[PDB]
Design a protein around this ligand. Structure first.
Ligand SMILES: Nc1nc2c(ncn2[C@@H]2O[C@H](COP(=O)(O)OP(=O)(O)O)[C@@H](O)[C@H]2O)c(=O)[nH]1
Ligand SMILES: [Mg+2]
Lengths: 90, 180, 319
């Protein structure tokens, strides 16, 4: 689903799926933007890198957005918090 | 005039007289029973040449979670007082292996001073016998200068917190190096 | 009992649930500054949590916490415990009590022995150029001065216990007067309270230390407050400093504009050419304006009454 959103250039659902948190204790397995600490403006979080990993073992969303995605929202979709920070990390 | 504030960080092995040295310098009284694991959040007033300096004494420990949060004390430091026990030389040989790289990796271009705490035990009979049981001898002053040569530290002076001897000139040298 | 329970009792301000803290700490030999009672990756103790969750401007759990901390021996450690995180490093509880505009708790903290010269070195306390939000001078007195809180400034400079000296500089060397120039915008309100607090602090430092001028202590960059105002594009404080007039006879030597004579509407006033035309051996405001003042206000600061004529007078002489 996330890969389909990346290919089809759906900014809203991709942005939601990237940083989705489930507050329920029953299902923390599905959350991605885990929260460590948050004082004032800082909302320090740990984004999961599943399907976004540096390794090429599986399809990478970075590759899809950079090359395959031809939608006009490509620049908008690269500006999400982990993807933009991941590229600067490299 | 205005009293400048210098950040001082004391690092060393377990039970090498760090907190005792800090308490002797600050409160002027050697702790009798309850010596804290870390002496934290204290500023000490000192004057060397008429320039008042407030030494922000930061203490570090290597016990329980203190080892994990010790790196966070290093930022913004002005002088590093690495500590080793004259009694037990194991601290002396483990300085260049662990403490010197640790200090340098988080505190580049910061003055480094290694101090021989527990100076009174050098001539103690009990400590000498305990070292001889393990085939060891108390750290010599020449050995201390030889250790300072390897690191290239600012200086080497010995302190004896229990006797309150050397507990002042060491901090005077530390604040003089920090003033640089 | 435990930090999730303690930070909730403190947050709710329920002294009735905080009764058993002292017997627990004494029988377990634990202290309120222990890592088991501090938020990880932040370093916040219970006191900042109490100073943030204020109802009706008061939190009754703060006196109880202070009393318990004194009983357990950690008073200076408890009050002066600084944040350890990257973005807030150095922030003690005094900065939080001053930023929250609660003078009562500022007095309570300073009386018990708060570190009045605690420097906040976090990234949020760096200049906007360096990647920060609120640069106030890093000092608790400078925070109050830059927050437009004259009463807290007067208290901190007139404590019976411990007075914050106004000549202190932060890691960058900026004093309170230097910190009032980095928080000064060109709006009318900013130019109307920044100058007022600047004059208040300058006169206070003149009376308290007659032999010292607070405007003559350069920072690590060698810039006096006038020089920094010229460099950083602050025109209101720049004009106020240059055209300064003070009426008090005890502190009349701080004037930079001296009305020499007046005939009706016309009046002749001498302007002090100090730090403006210093003959090269010192730094000059004119050089800073014409070289390093890249702001768009350069053509507006080169029109101040002495500077405009100072440049013109040079043209007639040798120009
Ligand atoms: N003989 C002697 N004993 C000391 C001296 N300084 C500290 N001690 C003892 O060494 C023990 C450990 O010191 P401490 O400061 O707790 O170690 P740290 O926490 O690692 O600095 C203390 O209980 C002191 O009684 C000294 O100068 N001479
Ligand atoms: Mg210790």
């Amino acid at each position: 689903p996330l890969m389909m959103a990346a290919k089809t250039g759906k900014i809203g659902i991709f942005q939601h799926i990237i940083r989705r948190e489930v507050t329920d204790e029953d299902t923390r397995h599905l959350s991605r933007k885990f929260k460590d600490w948050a004082y004032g403006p800082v909302y320090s979080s740990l984004y999961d890198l599943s399907s976004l990993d540096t390794c090429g073992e599986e399809a990478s969303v970075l590759e899809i957005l950079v090359y395959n995605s031809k939608i006009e929202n490509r620049h908008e979709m690269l500006a999400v918090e982990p993807i933009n920070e991941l590229l600067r990390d490299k | 005039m205005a009293a400048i504030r210098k950040k001082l960080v004391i690092v060393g092995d377990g039970a090498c007289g760090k907190t005792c040295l800090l308490i002797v310098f600050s409160k002027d009284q050697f702790p009798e029973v309850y010596v804290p694991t870390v002496f934290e959040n204290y500023v000490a007033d000192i004057e060397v040449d008429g320039k008042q300096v407030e030494l922000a004494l930061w203490d570090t420990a290597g016990q329980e979670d203190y080892d994990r949060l010790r790196p966070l004390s290093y930022p913004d430091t002005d002088v590093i007082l690495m500590c080793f026990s004259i009694d037990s030389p194991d601290s002396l040989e483990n300085i260049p292996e662990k403490w010197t790289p640790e200090v340098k990796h988080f505190c580049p271009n910061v003055p480094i001073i290694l101090v021989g705490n527990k100076k009174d035990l050098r001539n103690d009979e009990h400590t000498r016998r305990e070292l001889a049981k393990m085939k060891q001898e108390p750290v010599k002053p020449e050995e201390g200068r030889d250790m300072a040569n390897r690191i290239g530290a600012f200086g080497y002076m010995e302190c004896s917190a229990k006797t309150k001897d050397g507990v002042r000139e060491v901090f005077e040298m530390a604040t003089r190096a920090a003033l640089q």
